[PDB]
Write a protein that binds this DNA or RNA. Structure first.
Lengths: 223, 232, 223, 231
RNA sequence: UUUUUUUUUUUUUUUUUUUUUUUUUUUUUUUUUUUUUUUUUUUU
């Protein structure tokens, strides 16, 4: 009853890869990305402080504070949330891709791994492995790795009134490799603007069902 | 809530024709059907869904009244990708096939005695739970069963438009409409019937919109009673 | 896998009184009726199937299906919900009152036991023990005991657009002692109409939120 | 946990916040300063939660280097413990101190001392709706709880903030009731609700014209984002 | 359908208690894809 008055994800990734490089494969991760949603829900229902969900055949200790009451429980730099997984695991896939040149293996990834959030906006692997994987949440942790895309997708989304600005706040504090938010907002402006044009010219069309159906339903007042 | 998650494949197409599966079904079963059997089913459908999501077996054989049948189970979490041939049965597909079977019965004759029996016997909890009864029409009453989006023509678009009205009122999550929107109107693609049969649909909607949408109906004696005290 | 095709509160009361006559007193009950609300809330947050809430110093096993998902879990004729307590417990108070003639004890009840729903409509013990206690939910289970008041309050409420009719449905199926809904709707019409006049002439303004305030808030688009 | 207790029935007592405020300033003016208070306002909710564990009737918490005798009935069992119009709860402190800060600001027109105050003292709730000192002192501090004790002094803002909050469905209307029974200096609610209606609607318009974000965003971020056509 | 269940109504008090609570490479709240497939709301 008496009163007075630093998380690095690059580090967290090395930690995470170490403990799990062993147990990972495409089919496991694929299944994670599909149910990233489903678990956010369930964990909000569970009152517990931790949980060990299983994706396919890869169980993992994640911290739960999706439950209403836990939302403010502090978290160590090696701890996992679904968000942090989504980020780390996205980065993993990219690393799997750049590992090699194999068109056969590259095609396996584009076949196995699938990103609903991206596909829901008509964006596919053909657009770019970076830009594709940037739609997964948690990629704001690795702006240099993902070429500002996780940011600029957000920017572009906010510009079209499809996202509440307050969801950018996560990304705007994050580093660019070894630069503070305050520094790179100043230095990397053109680079960011390049990375936005790149985002702008994607097809933001397909994904929202067929076009016929899009419109049909609009006729009877819906979205 | 036991936080086990699984794959969800693509395996595109499958070309499932419900009219095809329906005939195969009537052939194999017409023999063993009757209002008592079916009546029961429609009341224990959701019951049977829940119970199959415990039983880990791939196939099951439930029994309604005195009618047993081979259904495919993948209500159970792990089984949700088990592939299904266009003659096989899920609860869903039965609910659709049987809903149509009942319609055929009604339309078979104009016997006021047999229609009597049908209204009286068979019952759609979902319809009644929106304050809707047989008197609104047969086609519209049975369209409230799930599975009837397999036969959009046969039920005069009502399965689609019920869904649309449901969304328009924020009574339903739009994900659940998507089922219908990929279905056919007898011999058309969605792409086609969405383009052409728009007027026909808006009619079907108007009909659905003019139903006594109550949620939890009342008894008829209660209204005439309350109407004594100036309530209506 | 194989399929085919009624709760009597008079009985449920005897069961309930038996198991709890022992542990009850005014100060306990009083506290229940105050937090009847607060528990409806909390139980909706708890995912569990049962709960043992404590009112003052009287703990009790009640069935929870205030949680969204449990709402359809079937319930035995001896089981308690808050609603069924509220009813039973209301009946208990009346029985306490008619037990005796003691003006001293009668005054202890009017002092100890308090009904917000009644007082919020300006209705107090002076109106009648029956009519007062009829504002408590769950009294529809005992229409004969509470002289059609639980019903007619509802009727009168609906007449003044202060209640959605659909809340009367509970009461309209309930018995009058040993008569079906279908029978007494026919036979007891005058009696009901007497019990409604009785209701009509109470004071519906006082006790609640002051009329000045009612309006004030309306001016800034509020009720 | 579901452990329900009884409820107070006694009425009116007399708690005159202007009275209790002077007694308080008298007893404590001595020991107060921006550092102490600054701290309080940041650990107020912290202290609430901690007192609802400590079963004692009274407590003596300390902020910065300022200790004080508060009355605890955050603890479940204690919620009916009766309180004299000179005693302190966290709530009443929040109100008293919010007023103390205002007196400080108004004491002079020293741009140097106002500087210090804006810089030091900080209302998490105001900042967490995207509101800062620049919106005005009276309006900024009204976001503290307890300031409904002094509706005049804070230009109705404590009431109208609450109203706007409900109008937006950001708040449960039960929590407005506190204010609606309070005074406007020398009037009953009954009176000031009747008469000072225009004055209130003004105070509302002011509150409604605040930059109601929710969660701040650094000033550099806005000017940055304004390069890409975002505000 | 229901002698079921659930969702509105929960008193006065210049009283008391209960939601809001900034900086942060923290945390939480949006976006979650194709098939006349399958699963997941609707159930008198």
């Amino acid at each position: 009853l008496v009163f007075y008055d630093g998380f690095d994800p690059d580090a967290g990734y090395m930690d995470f890869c170490v403990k799990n490089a062993e147990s990972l494969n495409l089919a496991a991760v694929r299944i994670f990305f599909l149910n990233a949603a489903k678990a956010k829900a369930a964990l909000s229902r569970k009152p517990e402080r931790k949980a060990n969900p299983k994706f396919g055949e890869w169980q993992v200790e994640v911290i739960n504070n999706h439950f209403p009451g836990n939302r403010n429980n502090p978290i160590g730099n090696n701890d996992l949330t679904i968000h942090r997984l989504s980020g780390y695991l996205a980065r993993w896939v990219l690393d799997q891709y750049n590992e090699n040149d194999d068109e056969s293996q590259h095609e396996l990834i584009r076949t196995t791994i699938i990103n609903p959030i991206a596909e829901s906006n008509g964006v596919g692997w053909d657009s770019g492995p970076e830009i594709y994987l940037s739609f997964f949440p948690g990629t704001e942790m690795f702006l240099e790795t993902f070429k500002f895309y996780p940011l600029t997708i957000g920017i572009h989304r906010v510009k079209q009134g499809m996202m509440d600005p307050q969801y950018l706040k996560k990304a705007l504090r994050q580093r660019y490799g070894t630069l503070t938010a305050d520094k790179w907002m100043s230095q990397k402006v053109a680079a960011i603007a390049k990375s936005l044009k790149d985002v702008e010219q994607l097809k933001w069309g397909k994904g929202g069902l067929s076009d016929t159906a899009k419109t049909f339903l609009q006729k009877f007042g819906i979205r």
